[PDB]
Amino acid sequence: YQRFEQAAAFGVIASNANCVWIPAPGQLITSALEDVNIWDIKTGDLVSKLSDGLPPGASDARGAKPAECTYLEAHKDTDLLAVGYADGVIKVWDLMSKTVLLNFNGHKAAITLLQFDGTGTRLISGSKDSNIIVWDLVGEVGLYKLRSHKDSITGFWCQGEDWLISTSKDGMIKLWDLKTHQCIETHIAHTGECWGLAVKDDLLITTGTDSQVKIWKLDIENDKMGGKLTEMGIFEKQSKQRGLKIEFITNKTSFFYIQNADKTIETFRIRKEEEIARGLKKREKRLKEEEIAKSIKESYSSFILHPFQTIRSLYKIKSASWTTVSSSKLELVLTTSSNTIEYYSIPYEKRDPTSPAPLKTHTIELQGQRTDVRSIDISDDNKLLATASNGSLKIWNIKTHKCIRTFECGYALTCKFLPGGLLVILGTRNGELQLFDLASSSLLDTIEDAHDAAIWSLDLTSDGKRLVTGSADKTVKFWDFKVLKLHHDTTLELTDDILCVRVSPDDRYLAISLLDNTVKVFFLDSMKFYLSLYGHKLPVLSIDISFDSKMIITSSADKNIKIWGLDFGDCHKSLFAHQDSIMNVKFLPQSHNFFSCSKDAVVKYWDGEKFECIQKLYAHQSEVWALAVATDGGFVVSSSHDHSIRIWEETSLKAGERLMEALDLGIAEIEGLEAYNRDMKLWQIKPQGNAVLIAVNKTPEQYIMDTLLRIRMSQLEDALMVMPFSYVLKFLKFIDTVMQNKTLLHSHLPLICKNLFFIIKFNHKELVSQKNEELKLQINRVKTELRSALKSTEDDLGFNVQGLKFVKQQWNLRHNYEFVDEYDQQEKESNSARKRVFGTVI
Amino acid sequence: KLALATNSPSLRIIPVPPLDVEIYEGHEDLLNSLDATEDGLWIATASKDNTAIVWRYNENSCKFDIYAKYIGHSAAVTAVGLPNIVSKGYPEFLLTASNDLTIKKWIITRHAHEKDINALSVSPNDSIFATASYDKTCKIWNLENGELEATLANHKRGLWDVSFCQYDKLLATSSGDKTVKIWSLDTFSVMKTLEGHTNAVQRCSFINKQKQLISCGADGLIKIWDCSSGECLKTLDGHNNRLWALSTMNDGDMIVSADADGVFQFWKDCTEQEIEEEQEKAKLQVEQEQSLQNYMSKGDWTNAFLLAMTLDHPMRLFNVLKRALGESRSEVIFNEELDQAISILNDEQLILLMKRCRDWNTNAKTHTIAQRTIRCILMHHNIAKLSEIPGMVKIVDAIIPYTQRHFTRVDNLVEQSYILDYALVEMDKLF
Amino acid sequence: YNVGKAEKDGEIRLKNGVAMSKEELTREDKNRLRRALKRKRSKA
Q: Which residues form a coiled coil (chain B)?
């Protein structure tokens, strides 16, 4: 009953996020998973890394995947590093103090682009949903948000406080104006989506999906549809994959590069005006040797552009950044898909590549794995033995977290650890079994054709004298270690492809996991078929035995750990967990508490006697693959498909009242303004408008009208009965102001009429008892304006009725043939007359 | 030109776009099967007469040489085949197959089946040879020898056509019943079953895009589907009684279908231009929609109205008309430029505008805007033109009674405001 | 005459004659109209 928290991380040199280069080559900032690495290129050592406050594995850690690092961007003048994580959160660190200082979460998806001016202290964020959000660092709030796209944001360029240009996967370019805070122009970039956007002040480069870049002209012209942005050029044939990023550099000649999806990054050069002149005069020679002129205006694209060269990297790429000096050498820092960093250099003399291929140097690959780890072992609580797919076996130590040596063996499937001499024994996907060292020379043996197909598992006794392997040729081969060669004592032939082998710790039982979903259990000294475990509905993938050889754990492809007893073969417990498929279970070396790791990226730590999940662990996000426990102490090691290795260590006014208050406010304001105007006429001080009006941007007469519209029409008569006569007088003054603001009058003519007539019909006695010439003149003006408005609408209606009746009668005159006989005409109209159905009782 | 083996003892050449006919004679009995090389100038004719003859073609002086003659056997030659050509212009051989149970492979003779055979297809690599019959099977053998490589076994009640998907290298067979079967050369097992057809297929072929199979049909129809899942993409019904023949130009995807009757049609691929015109309409639409929004926000009620009437966006149209009325509250009824635009409106736009105006005339809050636009239509259009527009009388019959109801309501409202007048009367009497 | 449901599929016509096209709505108003249609169809 202890807790477990993670305390380490390995193997992740660079993951799915951009890389930011810093000069003094300088250093590079790349991304681990919920972590950011920074290192020199000269030596490649972790000079710093940024964690968070609480470690994952604590009870206060939320039981979900912590989001990855998805984008990061630094301002060196302000020494700040903003970072966007995939659940939409923006953090900012320093590099000196390297601590979080403020936090943003406006978006609800992954975060794709971060463009920020520490000069302007403005951070503009484009996420994986369709909104772009402009934050202010010194304001620490969400300043505003431009949301008009419909898929995502992947191209992005801001200029001053004026313009913002973004390209989104609903494959279009939108030009936003920031002053009016809205999108002015739109152009469809490509047929499908479009990703890359590079902006020099004249030309603009937009890639598509089909090896097609488009060259655009940009202005500040006053036209509505064109003028701002035009479509001068189309250029073809970069590479058949998609173009992902366009980055643009200067010194004067200038360059840029298109980062594709495949192994290639293509660098292009844009030339100068004298080469423009030479090209146009040579094409003029081609002209003399108008339709040909516009053909030249079509070839304008290749006339401007110039393919400098390509960089054919290794297997795949992720991102890149420019590093150029002297206009004679240009360099690219590149992060690949697998965990490698490469520094590529090119010498040139402003015309020519001066090389058949770019030179590849300053490559960082050591502390990573370069592919995914399939198997994991531990060595006497001192070392770790990882192995992966590209032949890379690797030996790590827990103290200084680095490697020791590296081998090549092919597609590796299982590594085990002979403690005698600390040797490593690996079985591959080719049917072979190799054996390497750590202190002496690298390789000892490659037993070739140990089996005819892929062996699947391997183990060995606590004595270290006999090995057992299980292979998909229906074969279980028992080997002995002779003095340092290996012979095969015995070969057992079975019926199905064996998927796992496990020898009991106390040299008692041999468990075999067969693809026909069963577990055989043999006696180790006799091979006499002591037991069979049955009923997993899917092939069992992992078997382990307790320290006293009494409880078997078996785990299969249908998400349920089954605990069986070794005294009779009775299943003690079924236990459903791990929503995809459990790949490994491992006991503690002391008692019945085990760990389970699966294809849904959760490491669950169970008590066996209670059959309970003591702990859930949420280190990483992709599929877990391997797990191993310490022989004596009790640290845990889990390695996963994101090339990640984790090491775990233990520790309300009614209507009526609202109308009265709004009428109070409005008539107060109107009387104040009119008294000021009378004082202005006396002159021939402006009173300040009230807080609510200055806060909602409404004239007071529209404020009163709005509260009349908020009053629901079931309680309006009760409201106008509730208010007293002083507020009746204020109401009449308000309607006078409406009649002076005639357009409100015609837009809300019914409601104003109904309320006025009802108030006067209620209060007729006291209102006619009052003697007031201002009342007389107000009611005169209200009467005249009301008759004017209502007679206007009435004249419109009467004219329309007479006109439409004339039109319909004239068409009936032209196209309705009258039968002369009266009964026939009656029956004609009674047949062609419109009908309607209704449900009556008899 | 198109080569036709009809039910007449004369090969017929017709130009494809179509009236001129070239009739060439080589034998007394009617033609039965026809084949052509991939490059034009070589054709092979099998007739009901035992003679099978190969014609050289000559697009100089128009020659149709009958130069290769084959007497063969004492039955009817029912199918012919020649896959390829050597560079010098002598296609290597001709493999024909007969009314009786034999075939022959003659330079420029083995048992085949039980019943009559149906059709002969060739391999692109010029090595293997397919031949079916009415006995529910197909057979594939060598070209250098008559050794049977394999045999596709069985069906319900027969086979009608066989063909080779050249790119994917598949064996298609138009069945005797209402289906198509697709097999592969690896195991010769059932790769794809194509169903959904009505009576009988009688012809099956690949497409030039190497992904779509075409099946004709004796119920007078044609189906074109994707072979990846076997689901229909298009179905063409230009025919009336049957299907008998289907051929294809590869480079420009130009298929031609002919039946037992005289109707005779050519289809051409145009999906590229369809998608092109669609994307052009989309580009024009997004451009004028953005222009609509900018005009709407910046003012310009006339131009915003024009774009709203051309785009049919009734909510923005209603807001344009409401804002224009709110502006010209200060015999024009709107902005004068807007009035001129309405006077230069057109027919379908008049039907559209009066339809939407009837809709807004329904409720009592928007009846004012509806009355203004009706009055503008009346004050600036011709009444005879309005009466002669189709459907305008239906719309006017829908419009009138709501205007009568609104007239009575506003009349009653004025009748009510005379209480204001009465209050003035009594107040002035008191004072 | 009563204002029935719209003729085309790219339109939405409500019972008070306030027609709308599918091309002139934000996604928020689109979702709220879908919820209203959902509850009306869910009872009636």
A: none
